[PDB]
Design a protein around this motif. Structure first.
Motif, PDB file in Angstrom:
ATOM      1  N   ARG A   3       0.846  -1.196   0.000  1.00  0.00           N
ATOM      2  CA  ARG A   3       0.000   0.000   0.000  1.00  0.00           C
ATOM      3  C   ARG A   3       0.882   1.247   0.000  1.00  0.00           C
ATOM      4  O   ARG A   3       1.659   1.461   0.930  1.00  0.00           O
ATOM      5  N   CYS A   4       0.782   2.058  -1.054  1.00  0.00           N
ATOM      6  CA  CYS A   4       1.621   3.248  -1.163  1.00  0.00           C
ATOM      7  C   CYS A   4       0.957   4.545  -0.683  1.00  0.00           C
ATOM      8  O   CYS A   4      -0.262   4.723  -0.709  1.00  0.00           O
ATOM      9  N   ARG A   5       1.823   5.457  -0.251  1.00  0.00           N
ATOM     10  CA  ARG A   5       1.393   6.762   0.236  1.00  0.00           C
ATOM     11  C   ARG A   5       2.418   7.824  -0.152  1.00  0.00           C
ATOM     12  O   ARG A   5       3.624   7.577  -0.117  1.00  0.00           O
ATOM     13  N   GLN A   6       1.940   9.005  -0.523  1.00  0.00           N
ATOM     14  CA  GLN A   6       2.838  10.081  -0.927  1.00  0.00           C
ATOM     15  C   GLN A   6       3.487  10.732   0.293  1.00  0.00           C
ATOM     16  O   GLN A   6       2.846  11.491   1.020  1.00  0.00           O
ATOM     17  N   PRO A  18      -1.699  -9.191  -0.194  1.00  0.00           N
ATOM     18  CA  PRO A  18      -2.023  -9.052  -1.637  1.00  0.00           C
ATOM     19  C   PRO A  18      -0.991  -8.205  -2.377  1.00  0.00           C
ATOM     20  O   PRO A  18      -0.673  -8.468  -3.538  1.00  0.00           O
TER      21      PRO A  18
END
Length: 18
Positions: A3-6, A18
């Motif tokens: 899960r990516c975040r800026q 996943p």
RNA sequence: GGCAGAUCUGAGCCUGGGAGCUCUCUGCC
């Protein structure tokens, strides 16, 4: 999957099965 | 103690397009 975040101009990711 | 979300417009570091860690704020147990 991850899960990516800026953060810090860059995208930080967090391992999420996943 | 654990989980989730947020960001240099909450903040820092390393790598090198991400993956980790700490801190802060919010929420939940």
């Amino acid at each position: 999957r991850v899960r990516c975040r800026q953060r810090k101009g860059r995208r930080i990711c967090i391992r999420i099965x996943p």
